[PDB]
A paper describes a structure:
The human [name] tumor suppressor is a 393-residue protein that in response to cellular stress, acts as a transcription factor by binding as a tetramer to a wide range of DNA response elements, activating various events including DNA repair, cell-cycle arrest, senescence or apoptosis. Mutations in the [name] gene were observed in more than half of human cancers. To uncover the structural basis of rescuing [name] mutants by MQ we investigated by X-ray crystallography high-resolution structures of the core domains of mutant and wild-type [name] bound to MQ in the absence and/or the presence of their DNA response elements. These studies reveal diverse binding modes of MQ to specific cysteine residues that stabilize the proteins and their interaction with DNA.
In the crystal structures obtained by the soaking procedure referred as R273H-MQ (I) and [name]-MQ (I), bound MQ has been identified at residues: C182, C229, C275 and C277 in both structures, as well as at C273 in [name]-MQ (I). MQ-C229 conjugates are observed solely in the crystal structures R273H-MQ (I) and [name]-MQ (I), obtained by the soaking procedure. MQs bound to C275 in monomer C of [name]-MQ (I) forms CH···O interactions with MQr bound to C273, and with the side chain of D281. This conjugate is also incompatible with DNA binding. MQ-C275 in the structure of [name]-MQ (I) is close to the nearby MQ-C273 conjugate. C273 residue is unique among the [name] cysteins by being a result of a DNA-contact hotspot mutation common in human cancer. Interestingly, this residue is extensively modified in all eight monomers of the two [name]-MQ structures. In all monomers, a pivotal hydrogen bond is present between the tertiary amine of MQ and the amino group of K132, being further supported by the negatively charged E285 side chain. A common water molecule is anchoring several residues to form a stabilizing network of hydrogen bonds and CH···O interactions. These MQ-C273 conjugates are likely compatible with DNA binding as indicated by comparing the structure of an [name]-MQ monomer with that of wild-type [name] monomers interacting with DNA.
Numbering used by the authors:
A (entry chain A): 97 to 182, 186 to 289
B (entry chain D): 97 to 182, 185 to 223, 228 to 288
C (entry chain B): 97 to 287
D (entry chain C): 97 to 182, 186 to 288
The structure:
Amino acid sequence: VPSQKTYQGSYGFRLGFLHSGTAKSVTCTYSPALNKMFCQLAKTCPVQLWVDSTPPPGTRVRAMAIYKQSQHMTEVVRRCPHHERCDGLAPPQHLIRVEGNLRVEYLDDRNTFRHSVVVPYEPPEVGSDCTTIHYNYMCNSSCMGGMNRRPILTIITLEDSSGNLLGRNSFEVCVCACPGRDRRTEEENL
Amino acid sequence: VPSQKTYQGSYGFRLGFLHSGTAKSVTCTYSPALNKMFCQLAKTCPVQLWVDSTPPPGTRVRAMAIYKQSQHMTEVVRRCPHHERCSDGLAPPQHLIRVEGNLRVEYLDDRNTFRHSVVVPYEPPDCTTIHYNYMCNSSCMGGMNRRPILTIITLEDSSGNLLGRNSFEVCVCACPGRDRRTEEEN
Amino acid sequence: VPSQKTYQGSYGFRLGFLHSGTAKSVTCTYSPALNKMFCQLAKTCPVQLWVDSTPPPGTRVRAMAIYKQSQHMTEVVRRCPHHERCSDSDGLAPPQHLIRVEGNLRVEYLDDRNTFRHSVVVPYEPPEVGSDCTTIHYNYMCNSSCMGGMNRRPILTIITLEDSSGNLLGRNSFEVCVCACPGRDRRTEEE
Amino acid sequence: VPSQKTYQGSYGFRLGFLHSGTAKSVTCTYSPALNKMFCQLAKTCPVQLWVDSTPPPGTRVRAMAIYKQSQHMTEVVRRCPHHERCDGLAPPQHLIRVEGNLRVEYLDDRNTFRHSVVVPYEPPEVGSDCTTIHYNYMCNSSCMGGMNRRPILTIITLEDSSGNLLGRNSFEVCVCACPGRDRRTEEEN
Ligand SMILES: *C[C@@H]1C(=O)C2CCN1CC2
Ligand SMILES: *C[C@@H]1C(=O)C2CCN1CC2
Ligand SMILES: *C[C@@H]1C(=O)C2CCN1CC2
Ligand SMILES: *C[C@@H]1C(=O)C2CCN1CC2
Ligand SMILES: *C[C@H]1C(=O)C2CCN1CC2
Ligand SMILES: *C[C@H]1C(=O)C2CCN1CC2
Ligand SMILES: *C[C@H]1C(=O)C2CCN1CC2
Ligand SMILES: *C[C@H]1C(=O)C2CCN1CC2
Ligand SMILES: *C[C@H]1C(=O)C2CCN1CC2
Ligand SMILES: *C[C@H]1C(=O)C2CCN1CC2
Ligand SMILES: [Zn+2]
Ligand SMILES: [Zn+2]
Ligand SMILES: [Zn+2]
Ligand SMILES: [Zn+2]
């Protein structure tokens, strides 16, 4: 199973998320207490990259989903049969897409059969302190043919142009209709 | 500029404050005559919620800081760059107002106004108390820089409908007891 | 494992370091309490050599890094795969070597044929006109936190004074952190 | 030339000193009339920090010596060659050390070449009203090749974690064999 161990590494790599709140109209919202992103099917899911020093051009950022529970960790996370039968760049089986990036790259691992999506690292824009990638999750947590309500973790890895690992972080993910209500409910139960 | 007007609304919503006095040891103290809270950096600032009838479960209580002077009211109130680099794991580093001791605390960066606020669930008690922390001094250059602020406390239902609103002024300074006594002399 | 045992030897060989303090912007700074240098990736790290009597011409000054923890001491300290990738600023130095010397055209780098350890050596030069010490500017080419390299493990640098034929004359050592803000890391560690 | 202007600042920074008197046995004694400390070489010289409100954690306290006389003020105060010979954590050239503090930090200023010593500000223990720092002076005022009978001032500055001035005070210092007699004799004039 792919490592999920957090490493800030040489560049001080960590993730951040918008402080979106839990209003009914929010389409994605992150829970710091749960380290868990709540988002809507195929909607924009901003993840921020925070670094202490700037990685060189050529650095790449990879995202991969794995099942959190130990008895499902060896199963490849993929879309359900229904949603797979629905882009011109992403493989129809992949749960995680990146939108708004024409240099996006998709991988089916030839040995593990796991799916991942990678984009070029770009430094923050002029007035910004973080790089933002817009992920899309293409299947509901409740899709019976896929995750089937099993919790998943998204692993974000920073790697150089030769594939050497530079840092790693991760967050749990829920894909459901009303992420504001779901966040509020799950924090009530803790 | 977000609305600052007082409204007790349907539930008779008001704010209360402990009668802590101005002895040297006080870590925070409220002046009724100035409707002003004097507190210390990152120390407990208790605010009581008074209601004539209980809001339904799912009610929420929001706090937001705004500059009091009309020439500064459109500037977002945020921590100075020094303190923003100076976390509880839950709060954004730029936010002036935190809530301590509440694991269901939620923080908002408004996508369009860019203003900061902190919201907790309303819990029934004879008063509901929220422990706020103010994370930047009134005197911080680059932050409030000696400009007066108001904290706006809003009661909202679970759908975000406004139920009531109150407010108070706040000082964040090293000796709240001495500051209150001095300003009330003028 | 090469020796880290301090020995002033017959020339009274000692190390000195600038008294730089811990301001946030300082580029390197040494902690006497920790016998530890805090420096930045690829930036100047001055180390002073102090001798009681002047070593003969042909004397050489070697620097080598070793891991401090016993379960890693037989591992060669080297740059991580990421940083060991060749660059156009490598110059006179092997791309795998953690420790460089800057501003010295007579610098020499060694991959030991038998132990595979890396080291960098320069001629010993006596202090200039109105000076009491000789300064060498080292650069450390990999952060302490580099994945696939030091990977947060602590290291020592061993400075040896050698004769023209390589016999040990003197030896000292110090620990090294390579991090983004040495002033902060030192002030925080001394708490 | 560093500032010696007294500056109580926002925290109400003041110095205090023990009321030690001038008996023969005393090793450090302060003259209020002269604002001048009389202490022996390398012995404990206590200096109290008094504040009206507690400065934040991360505050630091710096000490630096300058020559009191205007015609010597640009000369760096340092130890004489005799005493400078190589001790613990301190640089051998530094006149002013701090005793009993593992977090002490010493600075040779890269631009002014001045020496100084810095420790973290600690608040007074609950019950106590002031913070004491134990300084040591490592050269006699009479040392040939060092101070050479020239009077010096010790400047104590309060700074925040980024080095910004919060407060400043100063006092004269005389390092000599018998501080009690020296103080008593100097107050006769
Ligand atoms: C992290 C960055 C910033 O500095 C602000 C908030 C979110 N992104 C874009 C603007
Ligand atoms: C040891 C030498 C000197 O005599 C001064 C201080 C540090 N180095 C360079 C100049
Ligand atoms: C700077 C180094 C490191 O990276 C860890 C923590 C402190 N030192 C020793 C090990
Ligand atoms: C240091 C003292 C003085 O002030 C003078 C000269 C030497 N001792 C005795 C008298
Ligand atoms: C997203 C949500 C679900 O639907 C189950 C897995 C994780 N989280 C809790 C239960
Ligand atoms: C808290 C105190 C200050 O520091 C200024 C703004 C508000 N109040 C009066 C002056
Ligand atoms: C980059 C690579 C080369 O091409 C030679 C010089 C340094 N490195 C090893 C050999
Ligand atoms: C310590 C670190 C910082 O935070 C900036 C100034 C100096 N150094 C590089 C960037
Ligand atoms: C602050 C000062 C005093 O007044 C006594 C107690 C502690 N310190 C030394 C003596
Ligand atoms: C210590 C004594 C001296 O030797 C001169 C300077 C200060 N004090 C008075 C004169
Ligand atoms: Zn599906
Ligand atoms: Zn501030
Ligand atoms: Zn590296
Ligand atoms: Zn002397």
